């Protein structure tokens, strides 16, 4: 059991290291926040007539 546990940990480390989908959810939130701010500011350049 100890061996399997230890192995699994090493497995996770490599999985995270070489991937690009891990924590995608956190990146998503950040991206959404940035978009909201970018939109808000950009519209300052609108003439509105």
């Amino acid at each position: 059991i100890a061996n399997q546990f230890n192995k699994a940990i090493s497995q996770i480390q490599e999985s995270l290291t070489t991937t690009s989908t891990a924590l995608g959810k956190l990146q998503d939130v950040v991206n959404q926040n940035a978009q909201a701010l970018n939109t808000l500011v950009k519209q300052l350049s609108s003439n509105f007539g």
Partner: protein, 48 residues
């Protein structure tokens, strides 16, 4: 007139007005550029 630096002043450059803090820059302008802007369309730096 002179240039007042490192403090908020009222400015009026050759076609650019407003208030702010004037400091020296390291921006590399082209031979045919008068002033620059930030990512958002506001004046960032000005050629004297």
């Amino acid at each position: 007139t002179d240039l007042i630096k490192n403090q908020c002043v009222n400015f009026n450059f050759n076609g650019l007005t407003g208030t702010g803090v004037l400091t020296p820059s390291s921006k590399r302008f082209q031979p045919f550029q008068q002033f620059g802007r930030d990512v958002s369309d506001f004046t960032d730096s000005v050629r004297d």
